[PDB]
Design a protein around this ligand. Structure first.
Ligand SMILES: Cc1[nH]c(/C=C2\C(=O)Nc3ccc(C(=O)N[C@H](C)c4ccc(F)cc4)cc32)c(C)c1NC(=O)CCl
Length: 501
């Protein structure tokens, strides 16, 4: 459902228009050839023109495949890779990996295989490519084409950039609509923030902080910000659309109430990966409750409503009695200086609630006052049923430790400590982070599961498209596949030749 003339909207600018970009973009290898999707694809395409470099890209692809390979199939896929890329006589032999290291990798194959057997060789390969091949790519037509894609990426976004549809959510400071990009046809969820209520409540810093946290998170298990733009009578936040409903609905309306332990394990693993991604940017969520975990069309989950999140300064603690009744950790109720620990408390509350079909401190069929719920959270120890395996009891108990200092995942090791827990013993996180494990519930497509100071504030909010989400949008809609064309037989196309603009 792309606009009639979408090819004219995303028409590449002549390379001569990107000179200012050329001398401004930081020529970082990991950014330009890995993190940025379109840059990664273009660098791989450059390597696909050189017999010498092709084999290294193929190798890294096969290593990526090996990491997610099932355990029983590791020794097989290992040998393959070996006898194909690392034997001296191979049409795809890679030499820049020291023969030394080849004879050291054979060893680890001669013993038990691990999912990290080729990490050494892959790092060697990246070191090779970070050098001469990268700098050649920089003086290549593929990097010019990357600059053209960057130019498009930075263009101003407006209301006309989008095509708003239906109001599919509501809230406090505004509402949540569904909006499509006319040029690409990709669907998103607009979060419309009414400028009036924001000026009144003086919530400038809160809306801004939410926008910054959303734009700086790049996770498969949290809602991503794609665009932040302004209009008349509102500001907008364009985020991941989630049409599969929320976890509260599936626990209570579609549940027993509750789930089988294994289904809850899938969801808990995905939520833990989301929290890990948030903790990499030392950001604390503090709003972990089942209605804020959303499902997508494929059955996977993402954390939503970051309006309560806070970027914690490293080495510093914050204070704030915020959240939802019944999902506030003890240190939060006591209004103490805390760190990321509230979130792990939340995680516990969710696993419990997923398995048992009720909160650990309030019965589903119970009617109590906020004060008694809080007293239970601070003094009462929760009880477990036969719906919990011993491992599940364990992880819930450790996450529901009242002393944030002794709570699982609140050490310097972080979420890793939780991923190792016996509760997750049958969970391959490499395959989950790669999207390779089938979700336990797949929603049906057709389903429906429900002044001048202000000017300066807007300037810092309405920053336009976000880089990684924009490029991923371009790829998913096949805009990139369609426009990324060159000259017949590996030659310069007109938009990249400086001779005849
Ligand atoms: C169609 C649809 N949109 C959504 C919603 C989202 C979504 O998809 N991504 C999202 C990312 C973030 C937020 C978010 O921060 N909200 C906060 C609390 C908020 C704040 C102020 C306000 F004024 C309104 C909302 C919401 C969503 C859902 C679940 C469905 N799904 C169904 O309704 C099942 Cl039929």
């Amino acid at each position: 459902g792309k606009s009639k003339k979408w090819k004219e909207i995303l028409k590449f600018p002549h390379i001569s228009q990107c000179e200012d970009l050329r001398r401004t973009i930081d020529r970082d290898y990991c950014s330009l050839c890995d993190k940025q999707p379109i840059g990664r694809l273009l660098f791989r395409q450059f390597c696909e023109t050189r017999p010498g470099l092709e084999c290294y890209i193929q190798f890294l692809d096969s290593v990526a495949e090996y990491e997610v390979t099932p355990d029983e199939k590791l020794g097989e896929k290992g040998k393959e890779i070996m006898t194909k890329y690392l034997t001296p006589k191979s049409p795809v032999f890679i030499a820049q990996v020291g023969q030394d290291l080849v004879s050291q990798t054979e060893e680890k194959l001669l013993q038990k295989p691990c999912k990290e057997l080729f990490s050494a060789c892959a790092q060697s390969v990246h070191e090779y490519l970070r050098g001469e091949p990268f700098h050649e790519y920089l003086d290549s037509m593929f990097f010019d084409r990357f600059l053209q894609w960057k130019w498009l990426e930075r263009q101003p976004v407006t209301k006309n950039t989008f095509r708003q549809y239906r109001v599919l959510g509501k809230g406090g400071f505004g509402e949540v609509c569904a909006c499509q990009v006319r040029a690409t046809g990709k669907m998103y969820a607009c979060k419309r923030l009414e400028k009036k209520r924001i000026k009144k409540r003086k919530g400038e810093s809160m809306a801004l902080n939410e926008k910054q946290i959303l734009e700086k998170v790049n996770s498969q298990f949290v809602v991503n910000l794609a665009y932040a733009y302004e209009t008349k009578d509102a500001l907008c936040l364009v985020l991941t659309i989630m049409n599969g409903g929320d976890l509260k609905f599936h626990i209570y309306n579609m549940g027993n109430p509750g789930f089988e332990e294994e289904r809850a394990l899938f969801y808990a693993a995905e939520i833990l990966c989301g929290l890990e991604d948030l903790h990499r940017e030392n950001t604390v969520y503090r709003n972990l409750k089942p209605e804020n975990i959303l499902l997508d069309d494929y059955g996977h989950i993402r954390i939503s409503d970051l309006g309560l999140a806070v970027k914690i300064p490293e080495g510093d603690l914050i204070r704030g009695r915020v959240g939802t009744v019944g999902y506030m950790a003890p240190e939060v109720l006591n209004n103490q200086r805390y760190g990321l620990s509230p979130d792990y408390w939340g995680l516990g509350c969710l696993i419990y609630e997923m398995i048992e079909g009720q909160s650990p401190f309030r019965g589903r069929k119970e009617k109590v006052k906020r004060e008694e719920v809080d007293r239970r959270v601070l003094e009462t120890e929760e009880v477990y049923s036969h719906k919990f395996s011993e491992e599940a009891k364990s992880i819930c108990k450790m996450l529901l430790t009242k002393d944030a200092k002794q709570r699982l995942g609140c050490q310097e090791e972080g979420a890793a400590e939780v991923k190792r827990h016996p509760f997750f013993r049958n969970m391959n996180f490499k395959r989950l982070e790669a999207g390779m494990l089938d979700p336990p519930f797949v929603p049906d497509p057709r389903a429906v599961y429900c002044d001048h100071t202000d000017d300066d504030f807007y300037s810092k909010f309405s920053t336009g498209s976000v880089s990684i989400p924009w490029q991923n949008e371009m790829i998913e809609t096949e805009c990139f596949k369609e426009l990324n064309v060159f000259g017949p037989n590996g030659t310069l196309p007109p938009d990249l030749n400086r001779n005849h603009p």
